[PDB]
Amino acid sequence: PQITLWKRPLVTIKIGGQLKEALLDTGADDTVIEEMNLPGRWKPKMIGGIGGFIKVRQYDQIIIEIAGHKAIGTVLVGPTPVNIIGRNLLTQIGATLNF
Amino acid sequence: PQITLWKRPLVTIKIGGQLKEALLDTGADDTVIEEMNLPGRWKPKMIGGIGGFIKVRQYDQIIIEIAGHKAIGTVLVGPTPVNIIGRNLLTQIGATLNF
Numbered sequence: 001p002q003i004t005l006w007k008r009p010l011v012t013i014k015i016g017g018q019l020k021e022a023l024l025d026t027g028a029d030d031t032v033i034e035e036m037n038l039p040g041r042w043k044p045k046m047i048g049g050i051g052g053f054i055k056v057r058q059y060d061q062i063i064i065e066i067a068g069h070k071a072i073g074t075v076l077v078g079p080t081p082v083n084i085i086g087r088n089l090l091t092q093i094g095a096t097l098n099f
Numbered sequence: 100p101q102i103t104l105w106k107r108p109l110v111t112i113k114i115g116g117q118l119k120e121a122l123l124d125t126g127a128d129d130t131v132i133e134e135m136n137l138p139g140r141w142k143p144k145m146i147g148g149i150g151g152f153i154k155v156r157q158y159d160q161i162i163i164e165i166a167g168h169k170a171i172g173t174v175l176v177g178p179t180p181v182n183i184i185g186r187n188l189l190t191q192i193g194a195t196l197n198f
């Protein structure tokens with residue numbers, strides 16, 4: 001699809017068999033999803049976030065569906081105020097900026 | 100142009116007659132530019148950046164060139180480690196996310 005930026009670029013995602021909405025964020029290196037139960041192994045991590053630093057669970061090789069487009073890659077799970085699709089997954093679905 | 104996201108989407112900008120580089124950031128509502136002299140009146144805001152909070156000065160009607168494209172809008176000036184072009188300016192240059 002072609003998504004203009006007149007409002008936040010929010011889309012529907014599927015992750016761990018659950019439908020959520022998420023922000024397509026070209027300024028994020030990584031993908032950060034809200035606290036949820038995920039099938040898969042995780043390792044502990046800390047990342048910078050809104051107003052400070054947060055503990056996250058890093059899940060590698062997660063199947064995630066972004067507006068109908070399949071991606072497999074790293075998802076960070078923790079107390080993010082917004083579900084964020086970062087470049088690690090935007091590259092997998094072939095997302096580009098155009099102007 | 101059509102910009103892939105394998106690295107951070109950095110472009111050259113021109114603001115206050117100074118050449119800089121900046122991150123095209125679809126996850127940002129606003130534009131945040133590092134400490135610099137803008138010839139205008141301003142109003143103080145706070146923004147929750149990655150790692151903590153900063154105090155910024157809001158400047159309106161700032162003329163800016165982004166990757167060759169002329170835009171006018173609001174810029175927040177403060178101690179940010181990265182120049183951020185947010186949606187308020189990305190809309191002005193006709194930027195879209197495509198996949």
Ligand SMILES: O=C(O)c1ccc2cc[nH]c2c1
Pocket residue numbers: 043044045046055056057
């Ligand atoms: O999920 C947890 O219980 C947990 C505990 C500690 C850390 C440190 C980074 N991530 C964590 C997750």
